[PDB]
Amino acid sequence: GVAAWLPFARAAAIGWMPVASGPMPAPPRQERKRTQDALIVLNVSGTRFQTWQDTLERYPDTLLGSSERDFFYHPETQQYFFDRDPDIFRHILNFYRTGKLHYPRHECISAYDEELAFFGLIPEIIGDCCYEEYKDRRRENAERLQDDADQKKARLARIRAAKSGSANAYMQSKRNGSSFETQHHHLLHCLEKTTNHEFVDEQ
Amino acid sequence: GVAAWLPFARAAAIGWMPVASGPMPAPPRQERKRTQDALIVLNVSGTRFQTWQDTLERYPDTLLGSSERDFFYHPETQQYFFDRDPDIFRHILNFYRTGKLHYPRHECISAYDEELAFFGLIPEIIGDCCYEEYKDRRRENAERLQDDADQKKARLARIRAAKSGSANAYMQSKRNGSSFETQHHHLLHCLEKTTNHEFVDEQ
Amino acid sequence: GVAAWLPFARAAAIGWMPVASGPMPAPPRQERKRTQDALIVLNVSGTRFQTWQDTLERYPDTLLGSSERDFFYHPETQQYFFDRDPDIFRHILNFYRTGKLHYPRHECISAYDEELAFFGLIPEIIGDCCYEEYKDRRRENAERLQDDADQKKARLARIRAAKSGSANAYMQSKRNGSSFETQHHHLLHCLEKTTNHEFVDEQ
Amino acid sequence: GVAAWLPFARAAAIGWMPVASGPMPAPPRQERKRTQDALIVLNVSGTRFQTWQDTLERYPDTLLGSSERDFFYHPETQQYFFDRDPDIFRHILNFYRTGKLHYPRHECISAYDEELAFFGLIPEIIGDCCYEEYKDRRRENAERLQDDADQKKARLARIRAAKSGSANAYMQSKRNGSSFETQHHHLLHCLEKTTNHEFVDEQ
Amino acid sequence: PEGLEQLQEQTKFTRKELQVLYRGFKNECPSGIVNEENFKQIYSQFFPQGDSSTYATFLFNAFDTNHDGSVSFEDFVAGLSVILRGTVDDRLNWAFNLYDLNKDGCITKEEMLDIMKSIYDMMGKYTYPALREEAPREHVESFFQKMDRNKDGVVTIEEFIESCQKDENIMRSMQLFDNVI
Amino acid sequence: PEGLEQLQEQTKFTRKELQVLYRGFKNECPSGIVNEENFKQIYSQFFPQGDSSTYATFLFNAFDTNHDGSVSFEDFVAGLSVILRGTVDDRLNWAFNLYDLNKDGCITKEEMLDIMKSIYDMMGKYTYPALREEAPREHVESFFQKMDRNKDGVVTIEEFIESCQKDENIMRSMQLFDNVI
Amino acid sequence: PEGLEQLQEQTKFTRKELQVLYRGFKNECPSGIVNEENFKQIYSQFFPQGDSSTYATFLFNAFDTNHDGSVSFEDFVAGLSVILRGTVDDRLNWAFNLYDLNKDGCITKEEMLDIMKSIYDMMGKYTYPALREEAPREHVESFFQKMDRNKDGVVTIEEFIESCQKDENIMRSMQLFDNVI
Amino acid sequence: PEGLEQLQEQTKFTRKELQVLYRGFKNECPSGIVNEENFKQIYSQFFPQGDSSTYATFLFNAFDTNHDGSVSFEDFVAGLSVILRGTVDDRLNWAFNLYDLNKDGCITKEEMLDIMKSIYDMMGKYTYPALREEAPREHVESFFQKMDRNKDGVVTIEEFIESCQKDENIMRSMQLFDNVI
Numbered sequence A, B, C, D: 001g002v003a004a005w006l007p008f009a010r011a012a013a014i015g016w017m018p019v020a021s022g023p024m025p026a027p028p029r030q031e032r033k034r035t036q037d038a039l040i041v042l043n044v045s046g047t048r049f050q051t052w053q054d055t056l057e058r059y060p061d062t063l064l065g066s067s068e069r070d071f072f073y074h075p076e077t078q079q080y081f082f083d084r085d086p087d088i089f090r091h092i093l094n095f096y097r098t099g100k101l102h103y104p105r106h107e108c109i110s111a112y113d114e115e116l117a118f119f120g121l122i123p124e125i126i127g128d129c130c131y132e133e134y135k136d137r138r139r140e141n142a143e144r145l146q147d148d149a150d151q152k153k154a155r156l157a158r159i160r161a162a163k164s165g166s167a168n169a170y171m172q173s174k175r176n177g178s179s180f181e182t183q184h185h186h187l188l189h190c191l192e193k194t195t196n197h198e199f200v201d202e203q
Numbered sequence E, F, G, H: 001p002e003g004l005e006q007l008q009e010q011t012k013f014t015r016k017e018l019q020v021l022y023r024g025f026k027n028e029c030p031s032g033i034v035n036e037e038n039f040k041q042i043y044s045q046f047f048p049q050g051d052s053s054t055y056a057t058f059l060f061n062a063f064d065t066n067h068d069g070s071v072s073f074e075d076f077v078a079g080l081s082v083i084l085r086g087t088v089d090d091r092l093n094w095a096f097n098l099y100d101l102n103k104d105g106c107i108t109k110e111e112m113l114d115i116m117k118s119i120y121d122m123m124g125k126y127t128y129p130a131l132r133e134e135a136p137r138e139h140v141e142s143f144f145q146k147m148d149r150n151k152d153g154v155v156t157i158e159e160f161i162e163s164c165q166k167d168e169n170i171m172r173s174m175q176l177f178d179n180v181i
């Protein structure tokens, strides 16, 4: 949380030191080159962020503070790469530096929440400066989602058209006789061979 | 669309594999070095964006997902260069990463729509989180355009003054006896020689 | 203005070419290595912007389109450096790329106008998409300035305190017997020697 | 303040020079390589800002204008590093370039004030263009803070849960028999040995 | 959440492969875990001409070993390592466990009927020969008369295995598809 | 949309030239295609003292080969390659097709009258000699008495060609302007 | 505000150490100084099972030498240099001054009672043996019967020092903890 | 606006010096030109204990050679080059032209009175000896009895020059201050 004043607290223990009656424990080795002057690079979609490693270690149980970060390290470039939004990542990093999370009013609440979930940040850590703003925006977006749950038909027609287009693309591939498309069509042909049935064109 | 879980689906086919009655098709070669660890650079007006190539391949029929991208490649610098707005390009790239398009409320709707058209994105792919905002802003800008169609006179006077200035600049070039200006004046002189008529100063 | 379709217009002249009665002028030399593939760098306060040189040449009579740009070139780094605001410079550059100027609603109107004046852009080139927004904001800021012209006293007290502090700093320098401060105090001492009078402490 | 026109004022002294009756002082040495063409780099959380050193020297008594800046210099990379927010730092730097501070309406007032305090900027230097906006936002945030002073219970429960979790983590470390956690637990064990008392699990 | 090194020493994937898998998994599931409904939504968009919900449920139950109701990245790569990188017997055990719904140790005709119903639901309602509404039944019959050897009305792991190694087409299918990727 | 490699093998432009042309084309037409009205708006701003709308219509019809009502980048570079990079006979065929409005195979006096009206519309209404309102008519007469050889009241491609090679000024104009750029 | 060079020549820290200390100090106190309340808020979060407010007040008074009511970075590193980098006698003088609340030059039993009350307040109200409500009193008694040598009812700096060097455990505690960091 | 190369060949400043001067000039005057009021506002903040408005007006009139009411960067660097880089006679001519308000070719006592009033206005109303309200008058008297040689009640350029070279302090002032910068 606050590792910067930890040496101060350890020094302040000197007021305890003489009045103690009995021995003292063994101090930790702490042989890790003091974990200082690191300045690691977090490359978020091409935007370079730089931070001290201890700053990230302030908050474990999050992505950047834990060993989960190792999943995004690139030893070739000696940097972590994230295929995420850099503008919201600015607030993500500011949280580690200060401890409080700010909500930018100009960003979509859904994008902000997705970035919070990706990096392991809980929305309850948003500071009181921004919490009312965030809560109001989240309420409007929940209201929209519930109103949809209980103009959607454009989305439904679009997704059905997308599935029809995928089926027609596979049928045209069959008629002819894009790596993803080739592997997906191979999987569909395997399904055909499994069921001994073949698809047919919808029109 | 989702190429990340394609190996999962291909593995899941193992539940089909034993119960099939008959042979199986030939698996694809897929000999393209797995198309992994690319991390291509999209230089938008000096701002470096970095992304995986498969992320862009998720959405063909757009500029970045198609071979149209090749028109913007710079083999000397080994990067794609776009003379476009980088702030809106952030949302363009976020679309490839997530599948949904967000609309930034602080940007002009005309600039946003021009960037969408340039990169081949259709406004109907804007997520429901931002669609009402986008629709309202587009409605205001359509209302302005229609009100103009049916304070414009300042624009009309400015454009007429610009044409008069261009004609006067060509006349002054003739009197004297900026590569673009020189070639354009050569074209106008060729027009003169074609019609055997010459321009004269408007004042 | 539009140099991209100039080769198209020169080619279209081929419809004039046969029907002309008489000779034709001499085509321009245009021996400047086609002025292509430049990709000049505009460093604005550490933010790299990159653009084609012809894009800037589209609009002379502005700073970036004229030889005034040469005042900001750094031959050592082979780039132009501007000690200006990069966020507003994004819109400045977008003007060259498109021809229209957009106004960001989230920026101060005074800062925007100062950046427009610095780079030689006239506010009347703001597109109709943003012109009403810009005009309204400029009206509010004019109203504030006029209301001041006809809470200012805090500013007046601050500036008087600043002048008193400068005079006291010079007096303390005299008592003792920061290059700018040293040269300024030398100028004040020269004024003293000119008038044969000396300053005295106000308190 | 304005060191750019200081040579102009020193030259203008030539109107005083002949009419003076008596000698003149010794001009300053000013032997510091003219302090020109520096272009120092301020690395704020990975974002490179570049500025002239004299621009920063315009305003001493602030962090960037004083020797306090030396606490953030990295001789290995030859740059100053700040683990701060770069977007607000843009306005911080704009203050040095122009003398006036602008307030971005889209940023949290608390974050803005914390960045102002860190870099030694006083909120009274905000220009009149942005002062009403800033004052209104600060008034709302003061109203929130006072309403809290006189939904907080969620914060109180969270902080109590955090202290309980820290105590339980130390107890589990004791049961077992993360450098910060190890040193902090060593300090707590030293406190135990000082008081000859041991902690016990709260549940 | 198991670390990269522990997943490297547990599964048969390299560090790069695990990193790519995690990248994709978190791109679809930012929280790092997936529930049955989101799993169905992910799996359905590979089958745009059918209903994969039942087979997706079977897959979710098979992959989610600890029965938490959630498939984590650990479940994900453990299953993917068993299928894509395991031996032929490992894959055959995984498939047999998929078919054995109650996990008792045998495959009944109704259990296989559920599996073939799920598989044929992907074929869609508009196919070439017909939607005979009985093709899964006779396919189960064929599967049993091929796999079962003592004709006890049930399939055991021994019969499943030995009948599988006695079918060259099954070998071709195992070696080719689950090893190319 | 034809790719960069296919346009390289079809047209006579290099990869760099095609990239620059595409950059400019998309800067003016972000959608990648241009209609007649946007084409007129683009073409007009090269002629600030006249009306180029009719000649622009002729150009748009000539460039848009497949008569889709839209000029794509393929139409654009195909026409630009024929004019700027083709032989003198290729350019002459292109110009003859521009003049032959009905594309039947001959140029009548009224067809040429439309062309010269379009060309003189760029001169503007305020020129040096006069707006005689008959200069296109007598210019058509001069063009016919120079080009036509059998005096049949029409111009054929053979007469157009041979009369063109019999005019040194036309050669100078072809070689210089359409090859410098 | 003292500069980096002056703090280097005053304290016993290197340039890198002073830079790291300033970085942390300004990260917690952006204004560059800390008052008693913010100091307590910082210090409390190292003791999540007790009340450190009284001991924090003692520390704040000891560190803030010029009695401005504010601890600056200069106060901070001066105290940290005396404790972490000073000799054993320097640390012992610092601790004695911490105990001597009135700074008169001696430690009374009530002064030590305040110190041990502050220290035991960190132990919390829920500890292993008991909250005897008298443990600080008898701990003061033990401290006096160990430190005091003339049994005058007070502790002087001479007795404090010599009794400290006569306790090997105190030496181990001084050398180990305040020199490892 | 004169270019960098033309200003290099006109003034005596190098490319770097002209670039720095332009940087500062545009930082204060983004439009590239400065009017009398903005000029006064710029010049005043070097004199925080007086009123420099009249002397600033004299400077603005002297620098703005073409009497456009605006000082451009060309005016700025032309004046700065004459003063900072010119010979002693060039500076003396510039100062004489500053004093000669009507530019007729001579300095009268009232012209010098205006100049000394402007100069003493910078001293402020609260100075050491006194605000005698007559010090400019007697300073003009001293200046005339030093500069004028034929005692005609006026100062000519010849007398100004020769009297200036006959004062060693004036030489020291010219060489030192206007050449160090």
Ligand SMILES: [Ca+2]
Binding pocket: E063, E064, E065, E066, E067, E068, E069, E070, E071, E072, E075
């Ligand atoms: Ca699980």
Ligand SMILES: [Ca+2]
Binding pocket: E100, E101, E102, E103, E104, E105, E106, E107, E108, E111
């Ligand atoms: Ca069973």
Ligand SMILES: [Ca+2]
Binding pocket: E147, E148, E149, E150, E151, E152, E153, E154, E155, E156, E159
């Ligand atoms: Ca059996």
Ligand SMILES: [Ca+2]
Binding pocket: F063, F064, F065, F066, F067, F068, F069, F070, F071, F072, F075
């Ligand atoms: Ca076409």
Ligand SMILES: [Ca+2]
Binding pocket: F100, F101, F102, F103, F104, F105, F106, F107, F108, F111
């Ligand atoms: Ca015809």
Ligand SMILES: [Ca+2]
Binding pocket: F147, F148, F149, F150, F151, F152, F153, F154, F155, F156, F159
């Ligand atoms: Ca004929």
Ligand SMILES: [Ca+2]
Binding pocket: G063, G064, G065, G066, G067, G068, G069, G070, G071, G072, G075
């Ligand atoms: Ca203090």
Ligand SMILES: [Ca+2]
Binding pocket: G100, G101, G102, G103, G104, G105, G106, G107, G108, G111
């Ligand atoms: Ca005492």
Ligand SMILES: [Ca+2]
Binding pocket: G147, G148, G149, G150, G151, G152, G153, G154, G155, G156, G159
């Ligand atoms: Ca004693």
Ligand SMILES: [Ca+2]
Binding pocket: H063, H064, H065, H066, H067, H068, H069, H070, H071, H072, H075
């Ligand atoms: Ca002038």
Ligand SMILES: [Ca+2]
Binding pocket: H100, H101, H102, H103, H104, H105, H106, H107, H108, H111
């Ligand atoms: Ca005169």
Ligand SMILES: [Ca+2]
Binding pocket: H147, H148, H149, H150, H151, H152, H153, H154, H155, H156, H159
């Ligand atoms: Ca005289």
Ligand SMILES: [Zn+2]
Binding pocket: A101, A102, A103, A127, A128, A129, A130, D108, D109, D110, D111
């Ligand atoms: Zn906030």
Ligand SMILES: [Zn+2]
Binding pocket: A108, A109, A110, A111, B101, B102, B103, B127, B128, B129, B130
């Ligand atoms: Zn959204």
Ligand SMILES: [Zn+2]
Binding pocket: B108, B109, B110, B111, C101, C102, C103, C127, C128, C129, C130
């Ligand atoms: Zn706009």
Ligand SMILES: [Zn+2]
Binding pocket: C108, C109, C110, C111, D101, D102, D103, D127, D128, D129, D130
């Ligand atoms: Zn402002």
